[PDB]
Structure formats: C-alpha cells, structure tokens
C-alpha cells in the first residue's frame, strides 16, 4: 500500500540498489520482489535520488519507517513540517514510500532492532497543559491541521513517541495543540493552532477545543502574554518610546470573570492646544514611562455644556487599548473612533469601556478619539489650511496601531475599524481611498 507521505525522518535503510536499464514498470516489478525476498523488510522506497540533477531510479529497502510527515491530505494551507529536500521525488505515481500490509506477526527476532530518532531538545511534561477527552469536539471540516504518523516499530515506549511529537510542536510557534492517537499500525500525532469554540451564556462561560477526528491524549502549550507585571500593574515595550504604565481590572460577563489589562489614555500625536491648533497631527516623541492609568479628556463637540470639567478638552488624541489576559497569539484588533460628551464628569471610568467586547471575543479593542467640530474640519481657500483635521488624525491612530500592536500581542493584518453614529459618515472615507496594499491600514469595516 502506498503511504500518503513524502518525507521521512528516522529512516533505517536495509538495502539500496540502482536501476536504470529497465523500464519503470519492469523496474518496479523487480522492486516489489526484492522486499519480498527480505524477511524483515518493513517496506520499500522507490524514488529518484538527486532529482535536482534528474538522477536515477532506486529501490531502497527499508528496515524502519520512523516518522512520516507532510501528508497530501490537508492540501498545503498550513504547513509546520518541511516536506523534503528537492532531491528526492516521491510525487509521481509509480514512485512512493511503500509499506507491507502490517501483519500482527512482526519481523522475526534476528532482524536488527530499530530505534526512534533521538529528540534534540529535552522536553518536559510540566510545560504542557494536559487536557481531558471531555473538553473537545470532533469537527471534520477544520483545515489548519497537520498529521505525523509514527509507526509501530517502537512497540513499547509510548512515552518516547509522545516526547518525540511534543518535541516537534515545541519547535514551531504556530503549533499550540498536540493530539495523538494510537491505532493499528502507527501512533497518529496531529498538530493544531489555537482552535477554541466557546459557548458564552449568562450562567457560565464554557470553552472547548475544535478538533478534526479525535485522539486519546491532548497536549497544549500554556498561555503567554507580552505584558510585564510589577506590583500587578501591566506594562509593555513600546518600540521607540519605552514602556507604558497601565492598569488592571477584573470584569464580569454572566457568572465568570476575566482580567483585562486596560491601558487607558495612550497618546499618539502632539496636543493641539495653542498655535498647534489648526495645523496637523505632528507625531510626538515621548520617552520613559507614560502614566496611562486614567481616561483622558474628550474633544469639544457641537452642543457642549458649559461645565469646564476635566473630561472634555481640545487635546483628546488619546487611545484606550483594552487587552484580555492571554489573548490569541496573532490576535485581532478593533479600532473604534468615538469622542464623548460631558454627561460623565471626570468619574474615572471610560464612556465606552470597550474591554467587554475584548473579553467576550478574545481580541484587542482600541477605543479612539478624534477632533469634531470647528477645531477640526476647518477648510479655507486653497492653501495650507486643508480642512481634514480629525480625519487625518484617524490615519495618525491607525498607523500608531499597525506599528505598536506587535508589542501588545495583536496582528496588524486582522485589524478592523468602526465608528459610532455620525462619525461613521466621516470615518467611512478611508474605505474609499485606494492606497498601496503593503500600507493598507485596516482589513475589516463595521
């Protein structure tokens, strides 16, 4: 039977023989008969060696088929296993890593005993959250999976097959879940990404893994966050500025809880207070620890009440990034442009605490602010006074995000935008402008 595989590590080659004077079919009929006249052939290969020069046809008899990877059954959508050097060609139909029908009568005892390939780095079971069978669902449609058959050559030492598959997921950052099942012929190790399926309700917050066809033992990398914790307040490396100095808070959705590491009031442009009024973003360069543990004042709006309170000002260009603990590794970001009124009066809570859509959806929320009124959107003539102030400040925030969100743990190719009521008229303009694909700001739009 042909294996559905194209690369093998831990190979144990029993015999090799070149053949080029025969045809393909007649040369293949020699190649089956040679493994037949070998009492502990497990299977044979049949492939061109040195295909980069167009090399000749071999019939290499194998003793063991150690680990079998890069299956041709997930397509090529998600590879974490290198599928061979381009010098063998196990691709064309008469060629193939073939094996015998695996009889329960094994190879007789005079054959040289085979070993698994040795693990490079020593793995520990303490660095892998073991999970139960009652916490997954079979989903025969998921497509970011991988598979690696480890054959029944290692009859004993199930824990050495396990330490070999976990030593492969520990080398790749894309793999986060390792499920492996024994079966008649191999130990089928599979590999996944962070494939969760939570069922949010009011009486609880249950979560469980998405899996293709189930396995016995399930192993998972633990959660990790890119946020430091001194005195249990969060901080984060900004690229060229330094560290922020944020705030932590536990929130309630139904009956369960989640820590959201709220960095409120993060600046992204210079304050247009006086004579920087009616000019520009003018990007600011601070350095050190920015005190980011409180909301900032919002912008002056048409219809502003006369209460000159520290909740409204002109310098509102400040972001409120709301991050759950242990997000998805390449996370998702929602940019939400919303200045607010003075109906709240310096209470210390944000007018839209966007950390709940962050928590329930396992994503990052950057609640934004932008100049509305006459302090922005003031055009005159055909000169330097342009009249897109606040509208070019939305670019000043979206470029802050897709530069500095790699520190917070996000992914600036899944980042969205959304505006509230009438700002959605003036924040839909960015979807119109055709720009370079390498510098596209968002990727969704609500």
């Amino acid at each position: 039977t042909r294996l559905p595989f194209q690369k093998l590590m831990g190979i144990s080659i029993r015999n090799k023989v070149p053949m080029s004077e025969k045809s393909i079919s007649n040369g293949f009929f020699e190649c089956e008969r040679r493994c037949d006249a070998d009492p502990c052939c497990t299977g044979f290969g049949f492939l061109n060696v040195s295909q980069l020069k167009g090399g000749e046809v071999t019939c290499l008899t194998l003793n063991s088929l150690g680990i079998q990877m890069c299956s041709e059954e997930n397509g090529g959508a998600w590879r974490i296993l290198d599928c061979g050097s381009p010098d063998i060609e196990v691709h064309t139909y008469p060629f193939g890593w073939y094996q015998k029908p695996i009889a329960q009568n094994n190879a007789p005892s005079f054959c040289p005993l085979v070993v698994l390939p040795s693990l490079t780095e020593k793995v520990s079971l303490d660095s892998w959250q073991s999970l139960a069978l009652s916490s997954v669902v079979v989903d025969p449609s998921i497509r970011h999976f991988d598979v690696a058959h480890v054959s029944t050559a290692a009859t004993s030492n199930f824990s050495a097959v396990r330490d070999l598959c976990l030593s492969e997921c520990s080398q790749h950052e894309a793999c986060l879940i390792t499920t492996l099942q024994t079966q008649p012929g191999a130990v089928r190790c599979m590999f996944y990404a962070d494939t969760q399926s939570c069922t949010h309700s009011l009486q609880g917050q249950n979560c469980r893994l998405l899996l293709r066809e189930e396995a016995t033992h399930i192993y998972r990398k633990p959660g990790i966050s890119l946020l430091s914790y001194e005195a249990s307040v969060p901080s984060v490396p900004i690229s060229t500025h330094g560290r922020l100095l944020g705030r932590s808070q536990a929130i309630q959705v139904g009956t369960s809880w989640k820590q959201v590491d709220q960095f409120l009031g993060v600046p992204y442009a210079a304050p247009p207070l006086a004579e920087r009024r009616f000019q520009a973003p003018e990007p600011l360069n601070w350095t050190g620890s920015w005190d980011a543990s409180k909301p900032r004042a919002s912008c002056w709006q048409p219809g502003t009440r006369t209460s000159t309170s520290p909740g409204v000002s002109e310098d509102c260009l400040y972001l409120n990034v709301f991050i759950p603990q242990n997000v998805a590794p390449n996370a998702s970001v929602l940019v939400f442009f919303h200045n607010t009124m003075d109906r709240e009066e310096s209470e210390g809570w944000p007018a839209i605490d966007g950390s709940f859509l962050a928590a329930v959806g396992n994503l990052i929320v950057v609640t934004a602010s932008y100049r509305v009124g006459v302090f922005g959107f003031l055009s005159s003539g055909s000169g330097e006074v342009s009249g897109n102030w606040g509208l070019l400040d939305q670019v000043a925030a979206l470029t802050w995000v897709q530069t500095h969100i790699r520190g917070f743990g996000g992914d600036p190719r899944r980042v969205s935008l959304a505006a509230d009521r009438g700002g959605a008229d003036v924040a839909s303009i960015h979807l119109l402008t055709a720009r370079a694909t390498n510098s596209q700001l968002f990727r969704r739009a609500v």
Partner: protein
C-alpha cells in the same frame, strides 16, 4: 474492444450463441458478466434459479419467478460442506458472505489464522494472504492498477477516486496512426512537465488523441459508448501554475476531458453522467427481448415497485435486490412512495411521552440551509428564469454541479483563482464549450473512429452531420429541451451570485452532504421544508399509512 470481449465471462458468450439460433431460451446475465440468480424463459412461464457456471440447481423449477433462491456464496457454502459430508473428508475453508449475498472481502476458515482479501466475483486476490486480519482490502481499481504495473497488457491506468472504485468516465489516450493504447504510466512519469496544459501536451505528442468512454464498476467498457475527443483546439486555463498532482487523476488535463465527455453525453443521452446500473440492465433486457426489464425513474436509481411481464410484482431498493415482504400478483404494491408520516408519527409520540416540564424536550430540512440557500437569493437563479422554455430537470442540475465539481477540493480552487465570473467557463472546460455543443461547433473537438457511430444516430433526426428519438441507449431525446438546458447552464456560470452560491456550498458539513450534488440534493429539497410545528403535535396516518 477485445480486452474485455475475450474475457467475456461466459454467461455473455452463451447469450449470443443462443440468441442467434432463435431459441425460446436465452440465459440472462448481470452487468458484470456473471449469471443472475434467477433465470427465466422468454415466455415467462418457467423460471428457475441457477448455479454458478450456468448449470441449474437440481430442482427449483417453479412455473413463475421463485420467491427466493440461493446466492453464489450459499451455493458454494453448501457444496463444500456436503462434500465434507458425502465424502466425509473435511475441507478447512467455508465462505463468510454477508446478508447481501455477495462475498465479504475478508475470507478465511473457522480457525481464523490466514484471512485474505477476495474479489467480489469470487477469485482470490493473489498477494494479500495476511496472517489473520486485513486492515483494508483492495478494491477493483487498485487491483487492476497494480496488475497493470506488473504488465498484463494495456499500459494506461484505469484511474479511480479515493477508495479504489472506478470513476464512471474513463479517459485513455491513443495515437491515431497505430490505434494502440498510449503508454501513460511511463509518459506521465518520464515527462511530467509536458503535462501542464494540452498545448504543452499536444506539442510533445502531435499524433495522440483523447479517448474517453463510460465504464461499469468492473472497469470493462460499456458497449457502443466510446468517444474520441480531439484535443487540438483546447486552449489553456488558469490552473497551469499549480504543481502537478500525484497520479494522472487529479491533473487538470484529466478533469477537462471528463467535462468535455459528459457535456456531449447531455445532448446525446439526456444525462449529464454515465448510465448507472439500472439503465444498463434496462437496455440489455430490451435488446435480447427476455422478460424482467427494470424501471428507472430518471434519477439513475431503480424505480421502487418493479413488475415483470404479465406475472408477479414486487418492489426493489436502490441496489437491484428484492424486498422480501412483498410479492403481490395483480396490482403493484405501495413501497414507501412518500409514506413518511408513520415514521414521523413515532417521533411525535416518543416526544409526547418524554417526562414533563420541558427540561430537555425543546432540545430533542437540515439546520443552516433554510436560512442561507433557499431564502437568501442563492437558489433563485436556479429554479426561475424568463419564461417556460426551460423544462430544466432538477435531476440534471444536481447532476450538473456533481460532474462539473466532483469534490470540495475543486470548488475552493475554482473560486480562489477567479476574479471575473464571465471567465469561469474558460478555465473550467477549456473554452466556451457549452454554446459550442449547444449551437453545434463541436465538429473539430470530436472525431470519427470512436465507437458510437454518429452517422447512424443523425439519420433519424436529419438535422446535421460532422463530415420518437433513441439516444445512446433506450432514452428519449427532446433535443430542443436538452439544448435549452445547456444554454441556461452556461448563463448559470456567468453570474456573480453563483460564485457566492458556490462559496456557501463549500461550508456545508460532510455528514449532511457528501458531494456537491448532495448539496444540490438538500437545497432543492429544503425549499419546500416549512419550519417544524409545535413539538406536541402528532399527525394522523391511514391504515397503511398515507398521511
């Protein structure tokens, strides 16, 4: 030709030697070439069941078709066992066939030490003698594909799909200048990069021509169905940039040929498919004139209630076998002909007798189909149009999506490499082939010396040439009806809202729909599924159950 006519499995040899003599008896075969279980006479006044090789059993000759006779397994399992009782010498083998009558794939004796895989006809597959339990058995393709590679003639692999069963359309290549079979297990191997497109293939073999033909589940060619598809004017596709697949099957050179084969078979046979097991048995019964002609209800499956000529009558499942609780002389019976109330009555009564208080009884058309396909403007391009001039059969559109897109691995790739929906017919058939076969610019894509004999097909129509009605088999061809469907089918693919129908057809789970034709089975059925009533409602059925 003769590679299946010399191993004609001599039931079919004994038909033609008896049919030409003008005799009152002729033996009746199955589609494979084996004898049927029940043999009859031409007048239908004496039917008797037969052994393996044409010899009848020693007394079952009922004046009429028997109620039940013995399968080829249980013929052999009695014949071995009484030979171990008359001669009293034991033989350490007896078959272990299932309820269907044919052999189980795994076969061994009572001690169960060497269990091997066997062919469905009966002969032992040479090589797979394991020591106790085969994990999988080879099917009819992979046996024929490997014995080919050992070298018993015909150097071109009878390609197959995913379990070793033959695909119904088989395309082999041939040089016209010698009329010998083109070597394909070597030319796909020795020249891989020559098989990118047909323009890159015809420049490497300027004498070869494609030869596609229908075939049964045994791999042998059906009689008078072979086409010789020319491949000169086939242009390139957008699928050239992808890598070459493993075998010849998944190559884009193969799937264009089966689409060009079955699109011709639509205007010839009225089916966008090869004929199934029902339609082959109906043609070979009408040809030799013997009784028990089957009935096929336009879907390829067997029509349920089947009567023979002026005799007893019964009903049949979708496999060709008799339902044992029915043999009614006179009127035809009523076997499950939309009688699903009495089964559905039992689900309401078991929901009626389930505790109290609605703790679970709430949670006791499929889901996510009624509110995505039949409501959201996606089915409305299909069963709708401008006027009455379609007669578009919906066991042709669910055959149209099935044969054009055979699996979900194509619907993702055809949608990912498509920007303009008007370009979709170009990179799917290799041209604008539906209006070339609708408005008949196909003289140049086909050719002579393919076993269909176009000339004796056009004389009963008198419309045109290349150089009621009966099609490739006993079929009715309203050719005006068939040409109007393919004009609609080309306009179906030139829509932005078919690509958005095809995107949601990928997201259908596997258990509710196996193939994309089964997606078209459920969606065309879910348009009538009104939402389920209140859970405590129970319908009322008749005596037999008729809602």
């Amino acid at each position: 030709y003769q590679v299946d006519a010399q191993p004609l499995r001599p039931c079919e040899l004994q038909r033609e030697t008896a049919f030409l003599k003008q005799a009152d008896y002729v033996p009746q075969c199955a589609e494979d070439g084996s004898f049927q279980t029940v043999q009859c006479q031409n007048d239908g006044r004496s039917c008797w069941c037969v052994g393996a090789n044409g010899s009848e059993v020693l007394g079952s000759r009922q004046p009429g078709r028997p109620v039940a006779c013995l399968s080829f397994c249980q013929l052999q399992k009695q014949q071995i066992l009484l030979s171990g009782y008359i001669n009293s010498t034991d033989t350490s083998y007896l078959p272990q066939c299932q309820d269907s009558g044919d052999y189980a794939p795994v076969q061994c004796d009572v001690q169960q030490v060497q269990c091997w895989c066997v062919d469905a006809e009966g002969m032992e597959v040479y090589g797979t003698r394991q020591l106790g339990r085969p994990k999988r058995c080879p099917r009819s393709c992979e046996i024929r594909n490997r014995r080919l590679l050992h070298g018993v003639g015909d150097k071109s692999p009878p390609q197959c799909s995913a379990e070793g069963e033959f695909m119904p359309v088989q395309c082999k290549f041939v040089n016209t200048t010698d009329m010998m079979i083109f070597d394909l297990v070597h030319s796909y191997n020795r020249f891989p990069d020559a098989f990118v497109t047909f323009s890159s293939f015809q420049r490497r073999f300027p004498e070869v021509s494609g030869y596609c033909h229908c075939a049964d589940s045994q791999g042998r060619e059906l009689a008078e169905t072979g086409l010789e598809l020319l491949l000169d004017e086939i242009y390139d596709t957008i699928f050239a940039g992808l890598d070459l697949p493993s075998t010849f099957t998944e190559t884009t050179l193969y799937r264009i040929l089966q689409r060009r084969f079955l699109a011709v078979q639509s205007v010839i046979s009225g089916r966008f498919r090869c004929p199934t097991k029902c339609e082959v048995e109906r043609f070979t019964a009408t040809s030799f004139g013997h009784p028990y002609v089957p009935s096929c209800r336009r879907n390829g499956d067997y029509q349920a209630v089947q009567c023979q000529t002026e005799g007893p009558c019964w009903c049949v499942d979708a496999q060709g076998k008799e339902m044992h609780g029915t043999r009614q002389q006179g009127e035809p019976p009523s076997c499950a002909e939309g009688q699903s109330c009495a089964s559905e009555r039992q689900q309401a009564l078991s929901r009626l007798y389930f505790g109290t208080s609605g703790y679970f009884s709430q949670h006791d058309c499929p889901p996510t189909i009624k509110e995505l396909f039949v409501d959201s403007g996606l089915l409305r391009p299909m069963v709708e149009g401008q006027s009455q001039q379609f007669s578009v059969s919906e066991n042709l559109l669910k055959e149209a999506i099935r044969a054009i897109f055979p699996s979900r691995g194509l619907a993702r790739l055809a949608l990912q490499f498509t920007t303009n929906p008007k370009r979709l017919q170009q990179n799917l058939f290799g041209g604008k082939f539906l209006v070339n076969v609708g408005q008949f610019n196909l003289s140049g894509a086909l050719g002579t010396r393919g076993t269909f004999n176009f000339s004796q097909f056009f004389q009963q129509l008198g419309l045109a040439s290349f150089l009621p009605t009966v099609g490739s088999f006993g079929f009715e061809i309203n050719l005006q009806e068939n040409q109007n469907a393919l004009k609609f089918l080309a306009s179906l693919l030139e829509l932005p809202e078919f690509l958005l129908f095809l995107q949601h057809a990928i997201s259908v789970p596997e258990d509710v729909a196996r193939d994309l034709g089964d997606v078209m089975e459920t969606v065309l059925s879910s348009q009538t599924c009104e939402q389920t009533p209140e859970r405590l409602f129970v319908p009322s059925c008749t005596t037999e159950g008729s809602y």
